[PDB]
Amino acid sequence: SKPFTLPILTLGELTNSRFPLPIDVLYTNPNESAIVQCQNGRCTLDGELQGTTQLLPTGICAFRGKVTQQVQDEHRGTHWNMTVTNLNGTPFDPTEDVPAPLGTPDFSGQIYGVISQRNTNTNLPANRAHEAVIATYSPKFTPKLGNIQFSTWETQDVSSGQPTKFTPVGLASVDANSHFDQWTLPSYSGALTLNMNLAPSVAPVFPGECLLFFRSFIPLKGGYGNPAIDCLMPQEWVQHLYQESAPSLSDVALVRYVNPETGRTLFEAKLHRNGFLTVARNSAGPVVAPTNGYFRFDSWVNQFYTLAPM
Amino acid sequence: SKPFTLPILTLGELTNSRFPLPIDVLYTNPNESAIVQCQNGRCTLDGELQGTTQLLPTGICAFRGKVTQQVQDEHRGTHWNMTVTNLNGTPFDPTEDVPAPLGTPDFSGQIYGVISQRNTNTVPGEGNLPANRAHEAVIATYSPKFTPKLGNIQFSTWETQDVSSGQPTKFTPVGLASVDANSHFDQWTLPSYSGALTLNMNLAPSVAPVFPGECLLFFRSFIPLKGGYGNPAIDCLMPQEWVQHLYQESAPSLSDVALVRYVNPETGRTLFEAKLHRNGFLTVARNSAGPVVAPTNGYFRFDSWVNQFYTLAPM
């Protein structure tokens, strides 16, 4: 039985699995009323990728496809309809058992980034890039049907029928009108259609426990705010578990957050088979820990195991 | 001795160690006249990071720091000086034995991306939340004002005034601004990390084939362009996941050369073989330039430790 392991990486050596950001802090929020059911950064302890999760850090919240039409906004800006493929360029097959093309954003909001194009025809091809926003709550956001819309400040210089890349950067806004909610899933096929093939929701099952997140702060194009994106496991953990595919010997692994210099354990956590952490903590906010700390697998336990309080 | 291993990742599951891009193809260019001495994606087989190499995919060609002021520059656009720290926010110590802050770009060109800011000061009326702004930006790494080893660089914007002095600033790389002759794109020309007329230090060594008939093998990614004509590429010696893997494992190197086979899983056949050298680069027996045409589900498998004298089967 191949022994289960986690990579040896400090917080400062980890990246977010839900947006291309470094991990900034560990974080808890016990009183969260929302169902936590993100679709990126989802992987079982035995290496099964779930939801829209793929392996490339460059694939998270990315799109590839071709623009088909320009449609002007009523008040300001320009919108562009885009047909999307798989990130590897192959046609996206809606009959595959995934919620949407892998890498598709898994939250409601205005995602800010850059649309770039390199033409097919030519001796060297023409190029252009512009800032763009994808409103994942929009009726036009239908990646499961193979089509989305992005908007630009640029009024004209986006070409139809040419290879197009979306590189995510941050959020456009977190104002009331911008509908940012990291735990609200997009309707991958539009508002009247149910999402399908979803990674399951995650929650503590044992009183006094709460979810433990790897938190990153996400840039803003404008406005006031300090928005964050919380993932269940960093991208490096997804990559590691996928590689190893070690058999899960129970439904709950016990892990210890250790300071390697002292060798002391700072706290312990349950790492659940479905790929998420819980701790015994009754407060919200960042976990204050030495920069050299990392998680080390200790042993397999069960749902009834009582964690040492934080 | 812990056995040496490579991750099991197809080309379509790998990313570039020199720019945040997926690996598109394997690539050779035997007649390259330039000295190959890139500083990102540098790691020995036994896990020693070199040059400006760090582990985060988000750190490659990234900067963190603070804008000081707008500055004059004869070149087009609006220009800004920013101090730079280490990516983790700690002050960059120029006395450390590295060429520049880890993650600093390792090539000459106009790097296009986004500068974003989140203010330190907050407003009570806004629920004690800070103001923000972001704009497209270009960093010319060949500029005499590109001095990351001295803790300062300059960027230009199309935006004329909406960049704030003294506020935390992040550069997210996206592509290149241009590859016209006037934009000085050369992937094998190192920036002068301490400015014009200064000598770079603490460099990862140059790499080259030493066996007749062999050439370097690269992991190539195509890099986006803000405008103009071109299909520019960035070639790395090993993908970022290999850097991450070697760093983790730190397996002792049992010789100077590891024999690896590029394998296709379905057929199970070996498409070709290559030398993976101690300092962290590949060579193959090939006499042509251009892409290696093979499935993107192919991957390198470690076979055994050989030596310098080993003769590769021609590709």
TrEMBL record, chain A:
Domain Calicivirus coat protein C-terminal positions: 84-310
Location of the protein in the cell: Host cytoplasm; Virion
Membrane-spanning intervals of the chain: none
Top-level lineage group: Viruses
Signal peptide: none
Presence of keyword Manganese: no
Name of the protein: Capsid protein
Upper taxonomic lineage: Viruses, Riboviria, Orthornavirae, Pisuviricota, Pisoniviricetes
Keywords associated with the record: Host cytoplasm, Virion
Gene Ontology cellular component annotations, sorted alphabetically: host cell cytoplasm; virion component
UniProt keyword annotation of GTP-binding present: no
Shown residues in whole-protein numbering: 224 to 538 of 548
Organism per entry: Norwalk virus (Norwalk calicivirus)
